Write a protein that binds this ligand. Structure first.
Ligand SMILES: [Mg+2]
Ligand SMILES: [Mg+2]
Ligand SMILES: [Mg+2]
Ligand SMILES: [Mg+2]
Ligand SMILES: [Mg+2]
Ligand SMILES: [Mg+2]
Ligand SMILES: [Mg+2]
Ligand SMILES: [Mg+2]
Ligand SMILES: [Mg+2]
Ligand SMILES: [Mg+2]
Ligand SMILES: [Mg+2]
Ligand SMILES: [Mg+2]
Ligand SMILES: [Mg+2]
Ligand SMILES: [Mg+2]
Ligand SMILES: [Mg+2]
Ligand SMILES: [Mg+2]
Ligand SMILES: [Mg+2]
Ligand SMILES: [Mg+2]
Ligand SMILES: [Mg+2]
Ligand SMILES: [Mg+2]
Ligand SMILES: [Mg+2]
Ligand SMILES: [Mg+2]
Ligand SMILES: [Mg+2]
Ligand SMILES: [Mg+2]
Ligand SMILES: [Mg+2]
Ligand SMILES: [Mg+2]
Ligand SMILES: [Mg+2]
Ligand SMILES: [Mg+2]
Ligand SMILES: [Mg+2]
Ligand SMILES: [Mg+2]
Ligand SMILES: [Mg+2]
Ligand SMILES: [Mg+2]
Ligand SMILES: [Mg+2]
Ligand SMILES: [Mg+2]
Ligand SMILES: [Mg+2]
Ligand SMILES: [Mg+2]
Ligand SMILES: [Mg+2]
Ligand SMILES: [Mg+2]
Ligand SMILES: [Zn+2]
Lengths: 208, 99, 104, 85
RNA sequence: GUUGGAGAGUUUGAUCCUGGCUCAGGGUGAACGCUGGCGGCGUGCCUAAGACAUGCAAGUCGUGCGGGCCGCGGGGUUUUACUCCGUGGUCAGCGGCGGACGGGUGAGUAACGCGUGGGUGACCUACCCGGAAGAGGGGGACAACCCGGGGAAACUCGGGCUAAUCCCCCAUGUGGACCCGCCCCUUGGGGUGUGUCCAAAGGGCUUUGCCCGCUUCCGGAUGGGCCCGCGUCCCAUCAGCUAGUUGGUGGGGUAAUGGCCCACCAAGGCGACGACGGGUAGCCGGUCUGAGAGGAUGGCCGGCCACAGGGGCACUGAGACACGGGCCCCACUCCUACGGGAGGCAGCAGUUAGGAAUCUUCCGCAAUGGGCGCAAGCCUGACGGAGCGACGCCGCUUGGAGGAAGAAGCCCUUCGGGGUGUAAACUCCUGAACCCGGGACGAAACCCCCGACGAGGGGACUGACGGUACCGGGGUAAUAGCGCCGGCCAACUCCGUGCCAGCAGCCGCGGUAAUACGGAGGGCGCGAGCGUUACCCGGAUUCACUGGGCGUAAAGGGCGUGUAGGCGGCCUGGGGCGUCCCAUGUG
């Protein structure tokens, strides 16, 4: 299935915050905040040089975890941007944002990505006016990501549809706060997304 | 046993025994045309030739010889009799023969 | 286009028949230098006209015997023994390279 | 004889049919001599049926026999229509 | 958008080069182990072309025709016997069309078998389409049925009746065939002149005309035989093979050319540019690998081939030399009265065998396809679906939001403390499964009336998946498992053990401080899969066209001569074979 387990420990594995714990992950709690060093018995001891391949892999893992999809199809998404006409680093992401489970988490309707998924899986979501239980979902420019009326008066929807009067979307996006709607303007750029990944280093792991 | 099948082999038998009668008539008859052709009896050979040539064609309407294969046996005979009568005497009838 | 072939007769020693040597040039499948490889076509010459060493064209045709599938079109040149010697030199040399032997 | 019929090119529960000209005894979905259109019987599109009339109108001056199904799909294509007075 | 190319480990006290073995990457018709919740779509005897029980797998037309039987209804007699017409249940037969298509398996073949492209003036072609014409007259058979004989059986023998689109003679012959003649073309192609020969069959109904048929002829299309050009694995530790062998004239045979086959005559044919023998394998579209060039491979789907227990053979027919047709021998199995006969799944499904491994004796002919029929219809183990198998790819759940300066227990500790770890406990939220109801598309044809039998229009029939998918409502917190952690290779410590026990792909670890063995805690990678074994490619510029080398590293023949073959100087011109270019047909 999906990975399911001790999430804020990769808040610390690759050494920087991955906001996957979600609304806690802006505390002086999310695990990183306390103890930067990554897991078990040794995590505090002196860390030596990382192999050329170490680093090659770290920065791949980060981007795989951070987006909350498992390897086997993190691949067919890479290998589907390769097969596509344009910059490979920049196409890749481009079809991470078009996935449904992170079409929500940037459209507001959730606290973290792992949560944001549940709402997709469970019949809660509208796509060009229909119900989609499919995180694997290719959201195109002009699509309509909303909520089905039935779930609307749920707290989790709403405390989150709240806070959005203090934030903004992401410039490829209109949020319709009140009407509970959302619109996919275009794809992103590598202009926008300021992730803590370096993407060529990802591709240099999918060269070997 | 499968009575769709058996039917067609009993069938076979009956046509083989009409196809035997057909051919093994024509051999016989046309051999007795070659024969009268040798010693110049242009009268009689040219008779036998036509009662050969027809028993040909009527085995050609049927499924014994083909039009291609029956036409064949017409040229075997017709020519070879027109030619045995070379080494003898001129065609009396001119039945199955074009001068 | 019942194929047309230019080759030089190398065998008279048969009846209404004759052997012809046609050759072709081409880049080697892989290695790709021009090579030149040839083959001999048992042609049909009825009236017997063409002789031992002539330069002829042949065309694909109604099968005449077992290995006769070419009639002879026309003559491009007569007298060209140069190759008939060469072809016989090759045919000769088989006398050598045997594990019967070759004497001095 | 020469015939015109239907040949499968979908999968389980998802048939998409092809219009074909092919020799009677030939295997169903086999080396046909001419594709003259498709027919979507699950009809999931605006274009769930194309034919092109002018070929089936050579192909019957030809003398290629339709099915029932395929016959009905040609009348409905316009294939068999007449005009003037 | 030149879209595309990662290497390390190991010879030595060490260093540079050669060079092999080795690992990392992707790949399957997979199996094996620990583990295994689901669905969609694929897919599943790779081994014995070993042997198969039972059922089905090709038949259909009563509008080609005559009866059996078992009834049912109506007629000639006042009543019986018996006989007359139709009709229903039905069963073989006579006849037509089909059985050669579909399906299966690669045993066989190194071959015109397959791929590519051409010849066929050397050819056939059923049902379908168009065009030209014609069905007049006479005769007889074989079944079915009846009566009789052989036989354990298989079934086989005998004489009699009879019809028909079954068989035959006569005529007309628009046309066609053959012989000979001329005239174009030029391998047997097209015309024309005389002689010669051949046609047919009737059933049905909306009966004085429409339908399914019938016969001879040119043509369309379709499919197909046959022939050639190039392509088509290895070993020369196989170098010489050939007597129907190569060619000639006559002949037979076929739809057709031809040693194909026969007779007779000349002595040829082939081969190092691999003849011959031996070994192996169906070939291809494509499939996997790879930067490319190549290397590997041809299950499924599709195109061509070849077989139907082994082998030879012909009949019927347009077609085969025929899987569920036929004649003969052999092996094997089986019935037997010891004369004799039966039998063929590599068609679906299963059994047995073998083997590391490969499944249901399922539903339905609704769809689609084929046979037959005027039609309703009929057969359809093709096929459409379901079942079983994580075998494979993809889609999906096992929660999520909050939560301690951070519980217990478990491990390390330098005894201060570090780690599992916000993970758990509880707080809140959502609701796979399940429950209730509704509930498909896939299917409009053939048919029927209108209308002309046409174009067009109207009505009717029908769902094996399935009470599935999907929509409305309800609702529980709700499977985790494998490999690894010295280097290459992401991951570090305590004990136990002490060259023992053991790991291992390579070098290697273990002889009381083991990051290597077995456990624990901790860690990395993956997730309904994770590993191991086998094979294909990459790595491997370690077969080197791209892209290599010989002084010592594996390697220059011990030296010449010279044949095949490979290669070649300067000046101009003709050819255009190569090579370039454009249009076109094919792929
Ligand atoms: Mg629901
Ligand atoms: Mg015959
Ligand atoms: Mg050393
Ligand atoms: Mg690679
Ligand atoms: Mg693997
Ligand atoms: Mg088990
Ligand atoms: Mg097998
Ligand atoms: Mg009756
Ligand atoms: Mg077949
Ligand atoms: Mg061989
Ligand atoms: Mg009798
Ligand atoms: Mg007559
Ligand atoms: Mg008749
Ligand atoms: Mg009659
Ligand atoms: Mg083999
Ligand atoms: Mg390479
Ligand atoms: Mg191969
Ligand atoms: Mg296949
Ligand atoms: Mg068998
Ligand atoms: Mg046999
Ligand atoms: Mg069988
Ligand atoms: Mg049908
Ligand atoms: Mg499954
Ligand atoms: Mg398993
Ligand atoms: Mg998956
Ligand atoms: Mg939680
Ligand atoms: Mg409908
Ligand atoms: Mg390491
Ligand atoms: Mg181990
Ligand atoms: Mg120790
Ligand atoms: Mg250990
Ligand atoms: Mg190589
Ligand atoms: Mg070298
Ligand atoms: Mg040396
Ligand atoms: Mg030496
Ligand atoms: Mg020169
Ligand atoms: Mg010059
Ligand atoms: Mg040129
Ligand atoms: Zn976090």
């Amino acid at each position: 299935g999906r990975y399911i387990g001790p999430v804020c420990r990769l808040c610390r594995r690759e050494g920087v915050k991955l906001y996957l714990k979600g609304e806690r992950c802006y505390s002086p709690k999310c695990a990183m905040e306390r103890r930067p060093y990554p897991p078990g018995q040794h995590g505090q001891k002196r860390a030596r040089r990382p192999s050329d391949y170490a680093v090659r892999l770290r920065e791949k893992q980060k981007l795989r975890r951070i987006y909350g999809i498992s390897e086997r199809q993190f691949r067919n998404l890479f290998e589907e941007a390769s097969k596509k006409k344009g910059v490979t680093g920049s196409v890749f992401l481009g079809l991470l944002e078009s996935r449904l489970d992170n079409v929500v988490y940037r459209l507001g309707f959730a606290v973290s990505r792992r949560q944001a998924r549940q709402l997709v899986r469970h019949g809660h979501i509208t796509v060009n006016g229909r119900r989609v239980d499919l995180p694997s979902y290719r959201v195109r420019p002009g699509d309509e990501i909303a909520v089905a009326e039935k779930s609307r008066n749920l707290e989790l929807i709403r405390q989150n549809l709240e806070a959005m009067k203090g934030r903004k979307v992401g410039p490829w996006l209109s949020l319709d706060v009140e009407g509970m709607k959302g619109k996919f303007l275009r794809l992103p750029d590598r202009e926008d997304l300021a992730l803590p990944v370096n993407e060529q280093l990802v591709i240099e792991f999918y060269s070997r | 046993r499968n009575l769709s099948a058996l039917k067609r082999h009993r069938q076979s038998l009956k046509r083989r025994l009409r196809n035997k009668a057909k051919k093994s008539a024509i051999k016989t008859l046309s051999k007795k045309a070659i024969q009268l052709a040798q010693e110049g009896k242009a009268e009689e050979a040219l008779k036998i030739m036509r009662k050969a040539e027809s028993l040909i064609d009527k085995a050609a309407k049927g499924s014994t010889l083909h039009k291609n294969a029956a036409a064949r046996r017409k040229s075997r005979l017709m020519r070879k009799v027109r030619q045995l009568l070379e080494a003898a005497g001129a065609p009396l009838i001119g039945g199955g023969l074009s001068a | 286009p019942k194929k047309v072939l230019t080759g030089v007769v190398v065998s008279d020693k048969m009846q209404k028949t004759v052997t012809v040597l046609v050759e072709r040039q081409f880049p080697h499948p892989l290695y790709g230098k021009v090579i030149k490889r040839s083959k001999k076509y048992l042609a049909h010459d009825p009236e017997e006209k063409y002789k031992l060493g002539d330069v002829v064209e042949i065309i694909e045709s109604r099968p005449i015997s077992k290995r006769k599938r070419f009639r002879v079109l026309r003559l491009v040149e007569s007298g060209r023994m140069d190759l008939v010697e060469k072809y016989l030199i090759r045919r000769q040399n088989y006398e050598s390279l045997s594990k019967r032997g070759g004497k001095a | 004889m020469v015939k015109i019929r239907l040949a499968r090119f979908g999968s389980k529960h998802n048939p998409h049919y092809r219009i074909v000209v092919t020799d009677a005894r030939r295997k169903r979905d086999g080396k046909y001599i001419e594709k003259i259109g498709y027919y979507d019987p699950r009809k999931t599109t605006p274009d769930w049926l194309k034919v092109d009339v002018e070929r089936a109108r050579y192909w019957l001056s030809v003398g290629a026999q339709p099915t029932d199904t395929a016959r009905r799909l040609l009348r409905q294509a316009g294939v068999f229509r007449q005009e003037a007075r």
